Amino acid sequence: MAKILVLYYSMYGHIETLAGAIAEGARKVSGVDVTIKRVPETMPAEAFKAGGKTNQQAPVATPHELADYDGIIFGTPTRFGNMSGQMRTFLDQTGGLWASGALYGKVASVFASTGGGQEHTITSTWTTLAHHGFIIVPIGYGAKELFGTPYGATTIARQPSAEELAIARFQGEHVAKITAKLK
Amino acid sequence: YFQGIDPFTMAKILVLYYSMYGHIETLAGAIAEGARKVSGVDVTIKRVPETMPAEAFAKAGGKTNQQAPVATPHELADYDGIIFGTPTRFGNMSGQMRTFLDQTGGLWASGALYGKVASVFASTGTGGGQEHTITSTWTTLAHHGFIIVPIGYGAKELFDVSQTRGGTPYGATTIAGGDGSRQPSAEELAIARFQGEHVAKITAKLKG
Amino acid sequence: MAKILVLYYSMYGHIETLAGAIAEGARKVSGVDVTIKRVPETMPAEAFKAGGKTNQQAPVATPHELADYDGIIFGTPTRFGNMSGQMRTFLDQTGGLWASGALYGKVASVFASTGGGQEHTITSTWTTLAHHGFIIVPIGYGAKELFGTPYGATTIARQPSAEELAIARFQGEHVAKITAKLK
Amino acid sequence: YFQGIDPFTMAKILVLYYSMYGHIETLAGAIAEGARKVSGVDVTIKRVPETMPAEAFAKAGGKTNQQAPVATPHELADYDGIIFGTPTRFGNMSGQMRTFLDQTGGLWASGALYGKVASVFASTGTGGGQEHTITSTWTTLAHHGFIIVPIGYGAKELFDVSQTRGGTPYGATTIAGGDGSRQPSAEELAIARFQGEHVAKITAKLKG
Ligand SMILES: [Cl-]
Numbered sequence: 189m190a191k192i193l194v195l196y197y198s199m200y201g202h203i204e205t206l207a208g209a210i211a212e213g214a215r216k217v218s219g220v221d222v223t224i225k226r227v228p229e230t231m232p233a234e235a236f237k238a239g240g241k242t243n244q245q246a247p248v249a250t251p252h253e254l255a256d257y258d259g260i261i262f263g264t265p266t267r268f269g270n271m272s273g274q275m276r277t278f279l280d281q282t283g284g285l286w287a288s289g290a291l292y293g294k295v296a297s298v299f300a301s302t303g304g305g306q307e308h309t310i311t312s313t314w315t316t317l318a319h320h321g322f323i324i325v326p327i328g329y330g331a332k333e334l335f336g337t338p339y340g341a342t343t344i345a346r347q348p349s350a351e352e353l354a355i356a357r358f359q360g361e362h363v364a365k366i367t368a369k370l371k
Numbered sequence: 372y373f374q375g376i377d378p379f380t381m382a383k384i385l386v387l388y389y390s391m392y393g394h395i396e397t398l399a400g401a402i403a404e405g406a407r408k409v410s411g412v413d414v415t416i417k418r419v420p421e422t423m424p425a426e427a428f429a430k431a432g433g434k435t436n437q438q439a440p441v442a443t444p445h446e447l448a449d450y451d452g453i454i455f456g457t458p459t460r461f462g463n464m465s466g467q468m469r470t471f472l473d474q475t476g477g478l479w480a481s482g483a484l485y486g487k488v489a490s491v492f493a494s495t496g497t498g499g500g501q502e503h504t505i506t507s508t509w510t511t512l513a514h515h516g517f518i519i520v521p522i523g524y525g526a527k528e529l530f531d532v533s534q535t536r537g538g539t540p541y542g543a544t545t546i547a548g549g550d551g552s553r554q555p556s557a558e559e560l561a562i563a564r565f566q567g568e569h570v571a572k573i574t575a576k577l578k579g
Numbered sequence: 580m581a582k583i584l585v586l587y588y589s590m591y592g593h594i595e596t597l598a599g600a601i602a603e604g605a606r607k608v609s610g611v612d613v614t615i616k617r618v619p620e621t622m623p624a625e626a627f628k629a630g631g632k633t634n635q636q637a638p639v640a641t642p643h644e645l646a647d648y649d650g651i652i653f654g655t656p657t658r659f660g661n662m663s664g665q666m667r668t669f670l671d672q673t674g675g676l677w678a679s680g681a682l683y684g685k686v687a688s689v690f691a692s693t694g695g696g697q698e699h700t701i702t703s704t705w706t707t708l709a710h711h712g713f714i715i716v717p718i719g720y721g722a723k724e725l726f727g728t729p730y731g732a733t734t735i736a737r738q739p740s741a742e743e744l745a746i747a748r749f750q751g752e753h754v755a756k757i758t759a760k761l762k
Numbered sequence: 763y764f765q766g767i768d769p770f771t772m773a774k775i776l777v778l779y780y781s782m783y784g785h786i787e788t789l790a791g792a793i794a795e796g797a798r799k800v801s802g803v804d805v806t807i808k809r810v811p812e813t814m815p816a817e818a819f820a821k822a823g824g825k826t827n828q829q830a831p832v833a834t835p836h837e838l839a840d841y842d843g844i845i846f847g848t849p850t851r852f853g854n855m856s857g858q859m860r861t862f863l864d865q866t867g868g869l870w871a872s873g874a875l876y877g878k879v880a881s882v883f884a885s886t887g888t889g890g891g892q893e894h895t896i897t898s899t900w901t902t903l904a905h906h907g908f909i910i911v912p913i914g915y916g917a918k919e920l921f922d923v924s925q926t927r928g929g930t931p932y933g934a935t936t937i938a939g940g941d942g943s944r945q946p947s948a949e950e951l952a953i954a955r956f957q958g959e960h961v962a963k964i965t966a967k968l969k970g
C-alpha cells in the first residue's frame with residue numbers, strides 16, 4: 189500500500205495551503221496513505237515579530253523519518269533564489285540516510301512559492317535529491333491551468349489562487365499514481 | 372479493439388544519442404547492455420541526424436561508421452523510456468540533439484511523451500560542463516512531462532577516484548580528451564551499465 | 580574608449596524594446612560606444628504566419644564579430660525553459676572564438692523575456708559564457724524597481740512596462756561602467 | 763574628510779573558506795598565492811565558524827588546527843573582492859558557508875556588497891556536484907550584486923585529463939576522496955593559483 193509524505197516549510201501560510209492541495213490530490217489514488225508534516229523552524233521564536241503564522245497544525249518531521257515513505261513531495265518558499273534555509277537545513281541533516289542509501293529509488297517531487305525565483309528553487313532541489321538517488325517527477329503540462337510551472341506547482345506569496353491549487357492537486361495525484369505503481 | 376490489443380506487453384527503451392568521435396556511441400552500447408539485463412524490456416539504439424556539413428565532419432576526423440539507425444522525432448512516442456546521450460556544447464546539450472528535440476513540438480502539443488521515463492548520459496573533452504549538460508537537459512525534458520531518473524551513488528565505481536573517471540549522480544559520463552583521443556574506461560562503462568539497468572527496472576515496473 | 584554590443588533575439592518585439600533601454604543605459608556612460616544587433620532568425624521566413632515582427636531595424640550580427648566588443652549584453656526570449664533556439668544556435672557557432680580564447684575576460688550580462696522561466700534562461704546563459712571566460716555581471720537590487728530579477732532585466736511577453744524598462748536602463752549603465760573601468 | 767581619505771588605495775581580496783578536513787584550506791592558500799602576484803592587492807585569508815558540535819567534528823577526524831582567523835559577517839563589506847571556498851553539501855555550498863552568508867542580510871539590505879568582485883572554489887569527495895556547488899553559489903552572490911568571475915579555460919592544466927584532477931571553467935576544485943584521504947594535486951593548486959591571480963587583476967583594475 190504506498191506511503192506519501194507531503195513535507196513543507198511555510199512562514200506566512202502560502203505553502204501550507206498548497207501542501208493541503210498536494211495532499212488532497214495524492215489521496216485521490218486508491219491505496220495511497222498521505223501524511224503532511226512541516227520541517228522545524230530555524231528562526232528564534234520571537235523573531236518569527238516578522239508576522240509568521242504560528243498556528244500550523246501539521247506535525248513537525250525529523251530527517252530520520254524520510255526513510256518510512258515511498259514518495260516525498262517537498263514544499264518550500266524561495267530564499268534569495270534558492271530553497272528556504274529551513275528546508276535546506278533539514279536536507280543538510282540527511283548524511284546518515286545518504287551513506288546507507290536509505291532514500292535510493294524513492295519518488296520525489298517539489299512545489300515552491302515565489303520570493304523571486306521559483307524555478308531555480310525547484311530545479312536546485314532536484315539536483316540535491318539526485319545525490320540521494322531519488323526518482324524525480326516534474327508535472328509537465330498535464331494540468332490545463334498551465335496554459336505554476338512544468339517543474340512543479342508554485343504560488344506567488346495574498347493567498348494561493350484556485351488555478352494554483354488545481355495544479356497542486358494534479359501534482360499530488362500524478363506523483364501518487366507513479367509511487368503506487370512503483371510499489 | 373478486438374485484435375489490435377496485444378496479450379503481452381514489453382517496456383520499450385530507446386537509447387537515443389549523438390556522437391561525433393564515438394565516445395557517446397560506446398557509452399550508448401553499455402547503457403543498452405544494462406537495460407537488456409531486465410526481463411520484459413525491449414532495447415533499441417538510435418542516433419539523431421548530423422547537422423554539420425559532411426565535409427567539415429570528415430575533415431574534423433568524425434566517425435561516419437555508426438551502425439545505429441537514424442531516429443525520427445515522431446517515433447519517440449512509441450517508447451516507454453528514453454535514455455538520451457550527448458556530448459556537451461558549453462555546458463548544454465549538443466546542437467545536434469537540441470535540433471532533434473526542437474522537432475518534437477508536435478509531440479509536446481499532444482502530450483505524446485507525457486509520463487514516460489527519461490535519463491541522460493554525456494561526454495565532454497575535459498570534464499568541463501558535464502554535470503550541467505545533464506541537468507539542463509532535465510529541464511527541457513520536464514516540459515514534455517518526463518519522469519527524470521538520476522543514478523545517485525548506486526554504481527560503486529563512482530567512489531573510485533584513483534583514475535580519470537566520468538560518471539556523476541546525475542548520469543553516466545565519459546571524458547574524451549580535448550582532442551577526443553581518450554577511450555571510455557571500464558569503470559565509465561560499468562556506471563553506464565548500471566544506469567541502463569536502473570532505468571529499465573523503473574520503466575518495466577511502471578509498465579507492468 | 581569601450582565598446583558594448585547589445586545582442587538580442589526577438590520574435591514579437593518585447594526583447595527588442597528592452598534592448599533599446601539596455602542600450603540607452605549604457606550610452607549614459609562617457610566614452611562608451613554602444614551597438615545594437617540581432618542574431619539571425621532560424622525559422623523559415625513564411626512560418627515566422629506565426630505573427631512575427633518582421634520590421635526590426637537592428638542589423639544582423641555574425642558570431643565572428645563578438646571579438647570586436649569589450650562587453651556584450653545578451654537578450655533572449657525563453658524557449659521551454661532555456662534560451663531561445665536562435666540565440667543558442669548563434670552561441671553554438673563560437674567554437675573558433677573559444678579555441679583561440681578570443682572572448683576571454685570580456686564582460687557579459689543577460690536579459691530575458693518570460694515564456695515560463697526567465698531565471699533559468701539567464702543563469703544557464705551564464706554557465707555557457709563561463710566556458711568562454713566571460714566576466715559575468717548580475718544586477719542585484721541596484722534598481723529600486725526590484726523592490727525584473729537580480730540576475731538581469733526581464734519582461735513578461737503586451738509591451739514591457741516602464742518598471743521593466745527602468746531596470747533594463749540600470750543594467751545597461753551598470754554593465755557599461757564596469758566595462759569602461761576594465762578597459 | 764580632510765584626514766580620513768587615504769593617498770593610496772589597495773584592492774582588498776578576502777579568501778573566505780570553510781574546510782573540515784583541510785582540502786579547501788590548502789586550495790585557499792594557492793588562491794591567495796595567486797592573488798599576491800598582483801601589484802597593489804592586499805590578500806587576507808579567513809574561515810567561517812564551525813556549525814557542528816566540537817565532539818562530532820573531532821570524532822569525525824576534522825582538522826581543528828586551522829590558523830586562519832574566523833571571519834565576521836559584517837567585515838565582508840571591507841573588501842573589494844571575495845573568493846569563496848567550500849566543500850559541497852549535495853551539490854550546494856556547505857551548511858557552514860550557507861549559515862555564514864545567511865548572516866549578511868544586513869549587508870544585503872544596505873547594498874554594502876554591491877558591485878564587489880566574487881569568485882568560487884569547491885571540494886567534493888568524488889567529484890559529484892562540484893560544478894553545481896559553484897554555480898548555485900553564484901546565484902546567491904547575485905542577490906548581493908556581486909560581479910561573478912569564472913575562470914574559463916585560462917589555466918591550461920584544465921586540458922590535462924591524464925590523472926584525477928579537480929578544476930572547472932566555473933572555478934577551481936579539488937577531489938578529496940569519499941574518505942578525505944586524497945591530497946590536493948599540483949595541477950589543482952596551479953588552477954587555483956590562476957584563479958586568484960585572475961580575480962585579483964580584475965579587482966585591482968576596477969579599484970585603480
Ligand atoms: Cl510561505
Ligand SMILES: [Cl-]
Nearest residue numbers: 390394395494
Ligand atoms: Cl562523443
Ligand SMILES: [Cl-]
Nearest residue numbers: 590591593594
Ligand atoms: Cl520577444
Ligand SMILES: [Cl-]
Nearest residue numbers: 781785786885
Ligand atoms: Cl575540504
